[PDB]
Design a protein around this motif. Structure first.
Motif, PDB file in Angstrom:
ATOM      1  N   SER A  16       0.808  -1.210   0.000  1.00 35.10           N
ATOM      2  CA  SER A  16       0.000   0.000   0.000  1.00 35.10           C
ATOM      3  C   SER A  16       0.846   1.266   0.000  1.00 35.10           C
ATOM      4  O   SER A  16       0.317   2.350   0.261  1.00 35.10           O
ATOM      5  N   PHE A  17       2.140   1.155  -0.287  1.00 39.80           N
ATOM      6  CA  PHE A  17       3.040   2.296  -0.339  1.00 39.80           C
ATOM      7  C   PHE A  17       3.760   2.330  -1.682  1.00 39.80           C
ATOM      8  O   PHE A  17       3.887   1.316  -2.371  1.00 39.80           O
ATOM      9  N   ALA A  18       4.236   3.518  -2.039  1.00 40.33           N
ATOM     10  CA  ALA A  18       4.996   3.716  -3.265  1.00 40.33           C
ATOM     11  C   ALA A  18       5.823   4.985  -3.103  1.00 40.33           C
ATOM     12  O   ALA A  18       5.626   5.762  -2.166  1.00 40.33           O
ATOM     13  N   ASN A  19       6.759   5.189  -4.024  1.00 39.40           N
ATOM     14  CA  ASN A  19       7.674   6.318  -3.962  1.00 39.40           C
ATOM     15  C   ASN A  19       7.034   7.544  -4.595  1.00 39.40           C
ATOM     16  O   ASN A  19       6.417   7.457  -5.660  1.00 39.40           O
ATOM     17  N   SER A  20       7.188   8.690  -3.932  1.00 43.00           N
ATOM     18  CA  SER A  20       6.586   9.938  -4.381  1.00 43.00           C
ATOM     19  C   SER A  20       7.540  10.824  -5.165  1.00 43.00           C
ATOM     20  O   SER A  20       7.090  11.581  -6.032  1.00 43.00           O
ATOM     21  N   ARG A  21       8.842  10.754  -4.885  1.00 45.05           N
ATOM     22  CA  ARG A  21       9.791  11.647  -5.537  1.00 45.05           C
ATOM     23  C   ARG A  21       9.896  11.390  -7.033  1.00 45.05           C
ATOM     24  O   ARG A  21      10.271  12.301  -7.778  1.00 45.05           O
ATOM     25  N   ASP A  22       9.572  10.184  -7.487  1.00 43.97           N
ATOM     26  CA  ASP A  22       9.662   9.811  -8.891  1.00 43.97           C
ATOM     27  C   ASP A  22       8.290   9.354  -9.373  1.00 43.97           C
ATOM     28  O   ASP A  22       7.311   9.342  -8.621  1.00 43.97           O
ATOM     29  N   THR A  23       8.227   8.976 -10.651  1.00 54.31           N
ATOM     30  CA  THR A  23       6.990   8.539 -11.286  1.00 54.31           C
ATOM     31  C   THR A  23       6.815   7.027 -11.234  1.00 54.31           C
ATOM     32  O   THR A  23       6.169   6.447 -12.116  1.00 54.31           O
ATOM     33  N   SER A  24       7.380   6.371 -10.220  1.00 53.85           N
ATOM     34  CA  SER A  24       7.318   4.918 -10.127  1.00 53.85           C
ATOM     35  C   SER A  24       5.995   4.414  -9.571  1.00 53.85           C
ATOM     36  O   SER A  24       5.721   3.213  -9.661  1.00 53.85           O
ATOM     37  N   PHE A  25       5.170   5.292  -8.999  1.00 54.39           N
ATOM     38  CA  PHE A  25       3.923   4.844  -8.393  1.00 54.39           C
ATOM     39  C   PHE A  25       2.908   4.383  -9.428  1.00 54.39           C
ATOM     40  O   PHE A  25       2.032   3.575  -9.099  1.00 54.39           O
ATOM     41  N   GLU A  26       3.007   4.867 -10.666  1.00 51.87           N
ATOM     42  CA  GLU A  26       2.066   4.446 -11.698  1.00 51.87           C
ATOM     43  C   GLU A  26       2.142   2.942 -11.919  1.00 51.87           C
ATOM     44  O   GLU A  26       1.117   2.247 -11.913  1.00 51.87           O
ATOM     45  N   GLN A  27       3.355   2.419 -12.119  1.00 53.06           N
ATOM     46  CA  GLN A  27       3.512   0.990 -12.352  1.00 53.06           C
ATOM     47  C   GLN A  27       3.056   0.186 -11.145  1.00 53.06           C
ATOM     48  O   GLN A  27       2.413  -0.858 -11.293  1.00 53.06           O
ATOM     49  N   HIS A  28       3.381   0.655  -9.940  1.00 51.79           N
ATOM     50  CA  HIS A  28       2.980  -0.059  -8.734  1.00 51.79           C
ATOM     51  C   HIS A  28       1.464  -0.170  -8.647  1.00 51.79           C
ATOM     52  O   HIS A  28       0.914  -1.263  -8.450  1.00 51.79           O
ATOM     53  N   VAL A  29       0.767   0.956  -8.808  1.00 57.93           N
ATOM     54  CA  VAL A  29      -0.690   0.946  -8.706  1.00 57.93           C
ATOM     55  C   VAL A  29      -1.295   0.081  -9.802  1.00 57.93           C
ATOM     56  O   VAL A  29      -2.213  -0.707  -9.552  1.00 57.93           O
ATOM     57  N   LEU A  30      -0.796   0.210 -11.034  1.00 61.97           N
ATOM     58  CA  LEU A  30      -1.365  -0.567 -12.130  1.00 61.97           C
ATOM     59  C   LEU A  30      -1.146  -2.060 -11.924  1.00 61.97           C
ATOM     60  O   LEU A  30      -2.034  -2.867 -12.218  1.00 61.97           O
ATOM     61  N   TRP A  31       0.028  -2.450 -11.424  1.00 61.59           N
ATOM     62  CA  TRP A  31       0.297  -3.864 -11.193  1.00 61.59           C
ATOM     63  C   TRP A  31      -0.580  -4.416 -10.075  1.00 61.59           C
ATOM     64  O   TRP A  31      -1.233  -5.451 -10.242  1.00 61.59           O
ATOM     65  N   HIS A  32      -0.616  -3.734  -8.929  1.00 63.13           N
ATOM     66  CA  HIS A  32      -1.332  -4.268  -7.778  1.00 63.13           C
ATOM     67  C   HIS A  32      -2.843  -4.136  -7.900  1.00 63.13           C
ATOM     68  O   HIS A  32      -3.565  -4.724  -7.087  1.00 63.13           O
ATOM     69  N   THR A  33      -3.339  -3.389  -8.881  1.00 60.35           N
ATOM     70  CA  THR A  33      -4.765  -3.317  -9.161  1.00 60.35           C
ATOM     71  C   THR A  33      -5.161  -4.125 -10.389  1.00 60.35           C
ATOM     72  O   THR A  33      -6.321  -4.058 -10.808  1.00 60.35           O
ATOM     73  N   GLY A  34      -4.234  -4.876 -10.976  1.00 59.85           N
ATOM     74  CA  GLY A  34      -4.560  -5.680 -12.136  1.00 59.85           C
ATOM     75  C   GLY A  34      -4.777  -4.891 -13.404  1.00 59.85           C
ATOM     76  O   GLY A  34      -5.452  -5.374 -14.314  1.00 59.85           O
ATOM     77  N   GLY A  35      -4.226  -3.681 -13.490  1.00 58.36           N
ATOM     78  CA  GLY A  35      -4.463  -2.818 -14.622  1.00 58.36           C
ATOM     79  C   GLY A  35      -5.771  -2.067 -14.569  1.00 58.36           C
ATOM     80  O   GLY A  35      -6.013  -1.212 -15.430  1.00 58.36           O
TER      81      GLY A  35
END
Lengths: 48, 49
Positions: A16-35
């Motif tokens: 339920s966490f991701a990095n804010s300083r970069d744009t890496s949260f997009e991939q995390h959210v998309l992966w853990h939500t099944g797209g």
């Protein structure tokens, strides 16, 4: 900050966490939500 | 090697990385399409009245 949030809200998981300083949260959210993505996005960040 | 990730919408193959590809439908209408010759195979009597 991750540790503080984990202490505050025990319901949150390590996925339920991701990095804010970069744009890496997009991939995390998309992966853990099944797209499917999310429903609400409370945004306060800018530019990319 | 090439990997296609539809959940994340990324295609990575070697040194390239496409993110956010969008494809629109083409008419697929080619002029002067084929005109096949259609026939029927049937018995014709030698003598017809």
């Amino acid at each position: 900050k991750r540790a503080y949030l984990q202490a505050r809200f025990p319901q949150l998981d390590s996925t339920s966490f991701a990095n804010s300083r970069d744009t890496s949260f997009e991939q995390h959210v998309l992966w853990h939500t099944g797209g499917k993505g999310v429903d609400l996005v409370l945004n306060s960040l800018a530019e990319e | 090697d090439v990997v296609v990730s539809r959940w994340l919408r990324v295609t990575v193959a070697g040194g390239v990385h496409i993110s956010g590809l969008h494809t629109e439908s083409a008419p697929r209408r080619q002029q002067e399409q084929q005109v096949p010759i259609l026939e029927k195979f049937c018995f014709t009597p030698h003598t017809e009245e």
